[PDB]
């Protein structure tokens, strides 16, 4: 075997370097000759497809000819009794050897982005799990807003569970040998959770607007039941509107190239000649930008009514409802702002990718990072804003 013969060569050169008697150099040089010729008879893994008389093979064997020649000279010098000269011949032998070893056999930014995505993966999983459990095991926190935020927490959870393949595709993009079903599956799930997140935030804000401006809400926003129905329909629309991903993306390779070397997970050719790519990009583009408009107007009205200008001489109180509504509306406002701010470069970059598919680095990387930074940052914002959430977490752990 080539590996066995090579380890044998390095071993006996190691002996020669640390051998005092000339006899030891004689033996080690003889065995190095034997393993050198035996290795020369063997075929390297990089030249097995080429014919035996191919030029590459003749070079690979030529280097071995030079090698065995040096072993012959060193063997003669060792037979004389000159240990120093034979060791020097073993040194130049090591030189030619190493040369033909290395001849026939973004990264820091990758480490940074990957490490950060791992941090957001840990803090994300733990944070959103703590959110769902806090809503689970406490009466005074089973409000409607906490239910919508719990569905959002699960959506972040599933997004982070989809992160690994997205990161593998982030650095390892030349080959995709994982399969077609995965290439469609993880992006389908990720997009579905995107739609569920945006629709859940929008439904939550609508419920706050109707709750504050129209106190007839007691009949309308009924109970947890309505919230469970809206969550069900939100996830159903997320899955159906993200269905076409199964046709949009796929694995493809060039004509005349090895599939194991040129397979990629990208929008298919049929997904481009028919504007399924542009159609889907405009679908999610509406799915993000339109609810951004709705959130802006709705929170504008909520802030207009709650934070209304009052004459300083006001003698009547504050009604004790606008206080709690100001708390939860503060929290939700910060959450929505972080959402838009984080997923804006993502949808911007996807728009640029769609428009470029019809004839930089830190932009795509910062979008990749921000996308998960939202999912990880929502529980942190819950811990900072809501005192009840903080008390519930500290009550669960300590």
């Amino acid at each position, epitope marked *: 075997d080539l590996e066995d013969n090579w380890e044998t060569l390095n071993d006996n050169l190691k002996v020669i370097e640390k051998a005092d008697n000339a006899a030891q150099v004689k033996d080690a040089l003889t065995k190095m000759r034997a393993a050198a010729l035996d290795a020369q008879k063997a075929t390297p893994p990089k030249l097995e497809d080429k014919s035996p008389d191919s030029p590459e093979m003749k070079d690979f064997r030529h280097g071995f000819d030079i090698l065995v020649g040096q072993i012959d000279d060193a063997l003669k010098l060792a037979n004389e009794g000159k240990v120093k000269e034979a060791q020097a011949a073993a040194e130049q032998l090591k030189t030619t050897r190493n040369a033909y070893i290395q001849k026939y056999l973004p990264a820091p930014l990758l480490a940074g982005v990957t490490a950060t995505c791992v941090a957001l993966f840990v803090v994300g999983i733990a944070g959103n799990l703590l959110t769902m459990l806090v809503v689970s095991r406490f009466r005074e926190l089973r409000t409607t807003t906490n239910l919508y935020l719990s569905s959002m927490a699960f959506s972040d959870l599933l997004i982070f569970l989809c992160m690994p393949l997205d990161l593998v595709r982030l650095w390892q993009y030349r080959p995709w040998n994982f399969g077609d079903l995965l290439c469609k599956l993880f992006q389908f799930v990720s997009e579905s959770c995107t739609y569920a997140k945006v629709l859940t935030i929008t439904a939550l804000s609508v419920e706050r607007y109707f709750a504050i401006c129209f106190p007839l809400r007691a009949k309308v926003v009924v109970t947890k039941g309505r919230v469970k129905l809206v969550i069900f329909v939100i996830w159903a629309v997320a899955f159906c509107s993200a269905g076409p991903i199964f046709v949009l993306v796929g694995v493809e390779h060039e004509q005349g190239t090895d599939p194991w070397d040129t397979n990629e997970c990208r929008p298919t050719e049929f997904a481009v000649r028919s504007g399924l790519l542009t159609v889907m990009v405009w679908v999610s583009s509406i799915f993000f930008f339109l609810p951004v408009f709705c959130l802006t107007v709705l929170y504008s009205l909520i802030g207009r009514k709650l934070w209304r*200008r009052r004459r300083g001489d006001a*003698v*009547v109180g504050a009604s004790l409802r606008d206080q709690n509504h100001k708390q939860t509306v503060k929290m939700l406002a910060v959450v929505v702002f972080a959402f838009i701010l984080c997923w804006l470069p993502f949808h911007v970059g996807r728009y640029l990718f769609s428009k470029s598919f019809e004839p930089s680095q830190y932009c795509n990387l910062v979008s990749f990072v921000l996308f998960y930074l939202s999912a990880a940052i929502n529980p942190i914002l819950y811990n900072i804003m809501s005192k009840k959430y903080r008390v519930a977490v500290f009550r669960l752990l300590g």
Partner: antibody
Amino acid sequence: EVQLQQSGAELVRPGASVKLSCKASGYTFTDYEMHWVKQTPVHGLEWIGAIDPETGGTVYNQKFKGKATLTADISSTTAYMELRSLTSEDSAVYFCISEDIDESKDYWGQGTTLTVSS
Amino acid sequence: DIVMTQSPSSLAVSAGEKVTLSCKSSQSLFNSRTRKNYLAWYQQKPGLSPTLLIYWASTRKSGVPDRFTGSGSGTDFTLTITSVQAEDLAVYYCKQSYYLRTFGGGTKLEIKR
């Protein structure tokens, strides 16, 4: 232009009740507070109470507590004051005052004359 | 409850002459948070409703002639008319806004002819 139209004069029998009105026009009815002032020749200007039309919360003076009841309707943009257990001391000139957000501006009505006698 | 007391009750003066009215409160009307003395001066002419002249006890409402000048702090306030005119025939009240509300006894201004 901001204008407040109060109710006409009232001649109420002693012991009965009455409810005065104050029709506000020319501004956002929910933004400005609505106060009520009782004017008598003996006691001068007496502050009855105030009400916020958006929340409905009221506040009264310790003297007119229970005597007066301030209400408000947003669809009609009209304030009301109910006076119960009327006597001759209640005969007076009642004003409604919309207090602008700008503390330099306030708006008075023409006044309602309450005469209570058998 | 804050009680207001004005002085004098009745005051006669000629045309163009100076006039000084006083409004004393039973409690300080200074809000240390807003740094404003919530004290207003109203002019009620006979047959009409009171109109605002001075708010914050030193700030003149837009449109009011500059001859009306209110001053004072704490519990003592004044309304000064530098050049009284025949149009100034009215009763001047002072309303506090520190607590709920309270008007003063009023001051009837009569001009001499």
